[PDB]
Amino acid sequence: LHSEIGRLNNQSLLWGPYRPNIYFGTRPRIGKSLMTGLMWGKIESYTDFQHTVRYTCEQNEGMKGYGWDEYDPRRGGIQSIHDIQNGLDITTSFVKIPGGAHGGSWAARIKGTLNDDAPKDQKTIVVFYVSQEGENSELEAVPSENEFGYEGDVILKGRSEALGNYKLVVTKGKGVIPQSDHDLSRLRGPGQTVVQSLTYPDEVLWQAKPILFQQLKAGIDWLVENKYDVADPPPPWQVYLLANKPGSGNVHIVQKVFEGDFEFDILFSSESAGKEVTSKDLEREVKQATEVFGERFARVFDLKAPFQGDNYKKFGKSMFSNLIGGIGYFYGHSLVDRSYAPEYDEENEGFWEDAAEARARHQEALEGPYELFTSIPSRPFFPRGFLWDEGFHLLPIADWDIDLALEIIKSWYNLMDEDGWIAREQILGAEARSKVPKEFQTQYPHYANPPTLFLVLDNFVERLRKLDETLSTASVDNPEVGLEYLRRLYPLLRRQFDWFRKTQAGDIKSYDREAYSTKEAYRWRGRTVSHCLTSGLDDYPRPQPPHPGELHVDLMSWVGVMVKSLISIGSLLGATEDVEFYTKVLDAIEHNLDDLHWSEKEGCYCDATIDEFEEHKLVCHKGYISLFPFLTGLLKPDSPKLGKLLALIGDESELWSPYGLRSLSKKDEFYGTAENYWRSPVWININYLAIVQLYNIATQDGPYKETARDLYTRLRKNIVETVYRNWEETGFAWEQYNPETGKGQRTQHFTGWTSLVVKIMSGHH
Numbered sequence: 001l002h003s004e005i006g007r008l009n010n011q012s013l014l015w016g017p018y019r020p021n022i023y024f025g026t027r028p029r030i031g032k033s034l035m036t037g038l039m040w041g042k043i044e045s046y047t048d049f050q051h052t053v054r055y056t057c058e059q060n061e062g063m064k065g066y067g068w069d070e071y072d073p074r075r076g077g078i079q080s081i082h083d084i085q086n087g088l089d090i091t092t093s094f095v096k097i098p099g100g101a102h103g104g105s106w107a108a109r110i111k112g113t114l115n116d117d118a119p120k121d122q123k124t125i126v127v128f129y130v131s132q133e134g135e136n137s138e139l140e141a142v143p144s145e146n147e148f149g150y151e152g153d154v155i156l157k158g159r160s161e162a163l164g165n166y167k168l169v170v171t172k173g174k175g176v177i178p179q180s181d182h183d184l185s186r187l188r189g190p191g192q193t194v195v196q197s198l199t200y201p202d203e204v205l206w207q208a209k210p211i212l213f214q215q216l217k218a219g220i221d222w223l224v225e226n227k228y229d230v231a232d233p234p235p236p237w238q239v240y241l242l243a244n245k246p247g248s249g250n251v252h253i254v255q256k257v258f259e260g261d262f263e264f265d266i267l268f269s270s271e272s273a274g275k276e277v278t279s280k281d282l283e284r285e286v287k288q289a290t291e292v293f294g295e296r297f298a299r300v301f302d303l304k305a306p307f308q309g310d311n312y313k314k315f316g317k318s319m320f321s322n323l324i325g326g327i328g329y330f331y332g333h334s335l336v337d338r339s340y341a342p343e344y345d346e347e348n349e350g351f352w353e354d355a356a357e358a359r360a361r362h363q364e365a366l367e368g369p370y371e372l373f374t375s376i377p378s379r380p381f382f383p384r385g386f387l388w389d390e391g392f393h394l395l396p397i398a399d400w401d402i403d404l405a406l407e408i409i410k411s412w413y414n415l416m417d418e419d420g421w422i423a424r425e426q427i428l429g430a431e432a433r434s435k436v437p438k439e440f441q442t443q444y445p446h447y448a449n450p451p452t453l454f455l456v457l458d459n460f461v462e463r464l465r466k467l468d469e470t471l472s473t474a475s476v477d478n479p480e481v482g483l484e485y486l487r488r489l490y491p492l493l494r495r496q497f498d499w500f501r502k503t504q505a506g507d508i509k510s511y512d513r514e515a516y517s518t519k520e521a522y523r524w525r526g527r528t529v530s531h532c533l534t535s536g537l538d539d540y541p542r543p544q545p546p547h548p549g550e551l552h553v554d555l556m557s558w559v560g561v562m563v564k565s566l567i568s569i570g571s572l573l574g575a576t577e578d579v580e581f582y583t584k585v586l587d588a589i590e591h592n593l594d595d596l597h598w599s600e601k602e603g604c605y606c607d608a609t610i611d612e613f614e615e616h617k618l619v620c621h622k623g624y625i626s627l628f629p630f631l632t633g634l635l636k637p638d639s640p641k642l643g644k645l646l647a648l649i650g651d652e653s654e655l656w657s658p659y660g661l662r663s664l665s666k667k668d669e670f671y672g673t674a675e676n677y678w679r680s681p682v683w684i685n686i687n688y689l690a691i692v693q694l695y696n697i698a699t700q701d702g703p704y705k706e707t708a709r710d711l712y713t714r715l716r717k718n719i720v721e722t723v724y725r726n727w728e729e730t731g732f733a734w735e736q737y738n739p740e741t742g743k744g745q746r747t748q749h750f751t752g753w754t755s756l757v758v759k760i761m762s763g764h765h
């Protein structure tokens, strides 16, 4: 039965618009298969289209905004795109139609509407680019009846092992096709849809823009060669219309020119399914998707007061839809330093310089290939898997569709190597590498990241203890299925746990260090003078200088998180011997957090270092780090320490801004210094954890229940209203929020853990 659900899941999720790095495109969850992508640009001149054409996601003054209005990876969704440069409001509706044995069918409608400022007679070039990778597979454009191009639809017929037989139709569409009275029309037609079918080696098919342009440039060279010149030149849009040449190949370019508003359909019909997909099918299934989307949202994300109004609902739908809409399938080789240079052990004083020297040996090589099915933080700026981000992304996603979340967790854990390491940043294949300078691609097997994916696991567990509709919850509704999933993941869970304890160990024994346990102590590998990238809190101030005797209270707290998850999961699987070992680790961490990290003087947790005189010194920087045992749900609800942390959290002069909790206290000497990434701004993910822990304390008998209730109430309110107000004004989710002004700053399109706001509004943790 577990096997069966797995197969149904695979079939359900196979197709999607799983290329979030581009404005619109599709691919199945198969590394070498059929991919599509959309491009458009106005043409006003002989040289402008190279600058106007859109393909990969960006965000600048030329683009008002874009994102998903509704989305569910089982069903499809609707995206709208507001393009200032090209004077166009675009809608891309995508829908999946189950059937056959090959992952079903799908359709999309592309609709472009000129805005009020666009010239009513704008010419817009639109291209649908289709590529297929694989050795024993075929794809052919059925030739036109007409001389120079297609009057009606374009039919591509193809076949592969993965997909069987299929057809892909790009329909005629609606809208004015401009017509050229130029001489050239005798050779190139007056203007019509054209197709060029081509072949390149599989590994470069992803380079759609250069492939398109090479074809355009060859068209222009031909014009020059055949005496079309500046004495009497064809219009721009005709100069940029490819010569029709459909055929066989692994690349098919379908180009249309439209004047004014336009729309057209793409119909992918899986032969093994019933009849082929039609435009009437598309319209109906889009209508049905929206309906179902609405019904699910109201149940899953029922916004509580004072966010029950329709303005907040629209906001919630957009934040949620952009987050789940970001889901991608990535495939390819990654860049990894597998030297395990001894300098990476960071055992000496001044280790960072040693580590730099090892890096400058440049032993990193490509390995894999790997695949990953994941949501991402940022379509325009970093459309790829980040390890601790995904823990946050999956929290709202799991509400929506627990089976989807488990699928993504499973996908991440399948990356894990023999030692228990998953790179914190997953750059798979040349397409993904194109977005990343070479200097930042290399992953290091000694670099951890917070294991926030356990948080998702914890939620699954609690849910477990207490057809698309069916499939979405099958792993909770069938407790047998749930347990098998856990049985199978559990060893990698344990492996990662052991990996943390092996590779990120702090040093008690070699110093004047007294604590309940000689074992429980942690130090993030990879820190430099100004940074600790692996912790997730890039420039939060740490002991200076960095030192092998450092201990990090956030890292120990993450280990606590993992061990508690292991207790619950082990217990479920009857892994008795393990659960005894875990229990003693938890007990030791509980004590050692205290012995090694608690500052009575300061009233909070501090990281630790080793002095000039070799003694254990606390290094206190009031901020998110300071709160970690609380944030990670480690403290008892009656803990006097918790009560002091509650005081710090509520304290306006320290962490509490009208906009949420500040990353670093205004009293800290490093407040608002350097790049000020984590040195003051409000981050939704850490605020999310605060809000969750406040609510836990608030709904249990105890001494701080009422303080917790007040802080919960207000923090929820401040965080939601801040993200809402900026969304209202800018159309964007942002990376972080200014505690003085409330303004979103750093990058936009951060969906991204900022989308946690839909669960904050939802409440009832």
Ligand SMILES: OC[C@@H]1[C@@H](O)[C@H](O)[C@@H](O)CN1CCc1ccc(CCNc2cc(Cl)cc(-c3cccnn3)c2)cc1
Residues within 6 Å of the ligand: 377, 381, 382, 386, 388, 389, 535, 536, 537, 538, 746, 747, 748
């Ligand atoms: O969320 C994932 C991670 C977290 O895991 C970490 O914990 C956190 O510390 C950071 N997070 C992001 C890590 C990150 C940040 C930044 C870049 C470079 C992006 N390049 C770029 C290019 C252009 Cl053309 C414009 C702009 C741009 C525009 C407007 C405003 N600001 N910038 C940016 C890569 C990766």
